[PDB]
Amino acid sequence: GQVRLGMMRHLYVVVDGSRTMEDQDLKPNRLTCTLKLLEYFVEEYFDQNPISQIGIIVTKSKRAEKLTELSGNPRKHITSLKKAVDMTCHGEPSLYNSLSIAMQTLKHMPGHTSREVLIIFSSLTTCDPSNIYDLIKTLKAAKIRVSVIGLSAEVRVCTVLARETGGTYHVILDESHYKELLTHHVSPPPASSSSECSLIRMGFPQHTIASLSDQDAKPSFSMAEPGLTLGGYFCPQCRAKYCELPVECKICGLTLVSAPHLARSYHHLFPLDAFQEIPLEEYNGERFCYGCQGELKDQHVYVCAVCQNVFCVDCDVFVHDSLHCCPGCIH
C-alpha cells in the first residue's frame, strides 16, 4: 500500500486466561503456544517499530489484570511472559473492564497515536457487566482500534468488533497460520479517515560520555537497583539522565529518539514493489543472479520492475523480508 500508516502505535495486548486456554488443540496447550508467539511478537514488533509501546493484560476469572504496563522495551514484557507461563487459567473471561481501562487511557491520549488493542481471544461465553452492543457503540465513538485473533470459532461479534473499532478478526488453523496472523499484526496498519495527523514535538539527545576523564562531570545514579552513572544520554527539555535513548521523557512528556530510530522504519514510506515471477527458461541471456552472482539451477526466475535485473529465490526471500530494497535500483 502507498497509504498513510499509523507509525506511532500504542498497541495493547489482551490475552485470554480463560478455561479454554488449557485446551490442547495446539501441540502444547493454547496458553503456552499463544504466549510463545507473543514472545516472538514483542520481539519482532520492537525489532521493527521502535517508537511504539506494548502493554499486556491477562483476562482471568471475569476480571481484567494489567499484567505489564505500557512501555517500550522488550525486556520487561518478555520477562513477564516467561513469568506468565506459570499461571493457572481459571474462570470465564470478562472483556468489559479491560477494554474499559484501555479506553480510559486511550481516550485523552495525543490524537496522533493510532491506539490499538489486540485481543487474542479463545473462549465463547463472555460475561458483560454493561450492554455489549452499547460498549461497541461507545468504542466506535471512542477513538481506538481493536483487532481480535480468535481461537476455534467465529462470532459475528468479533466481526463487528473488528470492523467497528476499525480492526480485523481472524480464526486460527495451525501454528503456521497463527504465525502469519501475528506477522500480519506486526506491520503498521493503515489509518482511517478519522485519526489525527498531528506534529509531535521530538527531542534528539546526543550521547555524552564522561566529558574529559570526568573533569567537572555530573555524577548521577539513573532515572529508572541502579549503579553510579558517569555519562550517557541527557534530555534537553529537562536535562535529566537516561541510560537508554528510546525512553519517553519521564518528567517532561517529550519523546526522545536517536538518528537510527526514524530510519529503522523508513521502508514503510517508500516501499518495495512486486517481483515479476516467471518459472520457465524464457529468453534468459543473463544466466547468473544479479543478487549474489550464482547460477539459476531451479525453475524460478524473479525479475524486478524498474531495473528488471535477475534474482533467484534466496535473493527474493532476502530482499523482500530483510533488506527491503532492490539492489539494482540503488545503482
Partner 1 sequence: LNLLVIVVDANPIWWGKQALKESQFTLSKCIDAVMVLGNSHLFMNRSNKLAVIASHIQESRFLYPGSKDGKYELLTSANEVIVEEIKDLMTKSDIKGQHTETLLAGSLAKALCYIHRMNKEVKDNQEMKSRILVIKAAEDSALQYMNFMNVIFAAQKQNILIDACVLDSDSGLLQQACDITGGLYLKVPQMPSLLQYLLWVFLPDQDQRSQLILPPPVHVDYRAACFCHRNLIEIGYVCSVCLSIFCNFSPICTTCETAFKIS
Partner 2 sequence: RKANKELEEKNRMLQEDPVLFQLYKDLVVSQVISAEEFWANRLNVNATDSSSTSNHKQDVGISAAFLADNLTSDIIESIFRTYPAVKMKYAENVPHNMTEKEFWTRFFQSHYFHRDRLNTGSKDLFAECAKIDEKGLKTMVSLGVKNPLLDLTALEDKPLDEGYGISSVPSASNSKSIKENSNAAIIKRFNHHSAMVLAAGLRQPAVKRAKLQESIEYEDLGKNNSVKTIALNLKKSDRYYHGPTPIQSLQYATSQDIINSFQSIRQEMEAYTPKLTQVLSSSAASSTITALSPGGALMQGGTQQAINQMVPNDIQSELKHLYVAVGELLRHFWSCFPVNTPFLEEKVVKMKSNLERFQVTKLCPFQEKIRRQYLSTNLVSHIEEMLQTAYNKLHTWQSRRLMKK
Partner 3 sequence: YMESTVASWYEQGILENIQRNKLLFIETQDGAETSVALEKYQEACENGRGAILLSVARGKVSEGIDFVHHYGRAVIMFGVPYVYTQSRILKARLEYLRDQFQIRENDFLTFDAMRHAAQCVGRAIRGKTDYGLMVFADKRFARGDKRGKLPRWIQEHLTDANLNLTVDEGVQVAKYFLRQMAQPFHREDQL
Q: Which of 86, 173, 213, 285 binds partner 2 (CB under 8 A)?
A: 213
Q: What distance in Å separates the CA atoms of residue 312 and residue 261, rounded to the nearest whole number?
A: 31
Distance CA 270, CA 30 (A): 38
- For 183-200, b/e burial (b = at least 16 CB within 10 A) is eebbebbebeeebeeeee
Among 218, 232, 246, 316, binds partner 2 (CB under 8 A): 218
Amino acid, single-letter form, for residue 118? L
Which H or E element spans position 105? helix 97-105
The answer to whether 252 and 237 are in contact (CB under 8 A) is: yes
Instruction: By CB under 8 A, name the one of 86, 173, 197, 221 that touches partner 1.
Output: 197
Site for partner 2 in 240-299 (CB under 8 A): 240-241, 250-253, 259, 263, 266, 269-270
CB-hemisphere CA count at 13 Å for 258? 16
Closer residue to partner 3 in complex, CB, 158/240:
158
Number of residues that bind partner 1 (CB under 8 A): 48
Site membership for partner 3, residue 252 (CB under 8 A): no
Cα distances (Å, whole numbers) of residue 245 to 77, 98, 218: 18, 31, 18
Instruction: Check residue 141 for interaction with partner 1 (CB under 8 A).
Output: no
Among the residue ranges 79-87, 110-118, 126-134, 267-275, the one whose residues contact partner 3 (CB under 8 A): 126-134
Sheet holding 116-121, edge to edge: 63-71, 54-60, 11-16, 116-121, 145-150, 169-171
Distances (CA, A) of 134 to 128, 129, 138, 139, 179: 11, 11, 6, 8, 33
**Residue from 69, 134, 154, 298 binding partner 3 (CB under 8 A):** 154
Tell me which of 12, 41, 46, 96 binds partner 2, using CB under 8 A: 96
- Considering only 100-108, 136-144, 175-183, 319-327, which stretch makes contact with partner 1 by CB under 8 A? 319-327
> Can residue 3 be called a binding residue for partner 1 (CB under 8 A)?
no
Distance, in Å, from the CA atom of 195 to the CA atom of 187, rounded to the nearest integer, reads 18
Cell output for 283: 529468453
- Please give the residue ranges that form the binding site for partner 1 (CB under 8 A): 4, 7-8, 47, 112, 196-207, 209, 236-237, 245, 258-260, 262-267, 269-270, 291-294, 314-315, 317-319, 322-325, 327, 330-331
Residues that bind partner 2 (CB under 8 A): 1-4, 62-64, 92, 94, 96-97, 100-101, 104, 125, 127-131, 156, 163, 190-193, 197, 204, 213-214, 218-223, 228, 230, 237-241, 250-253, 259, 263, 266, 269-270
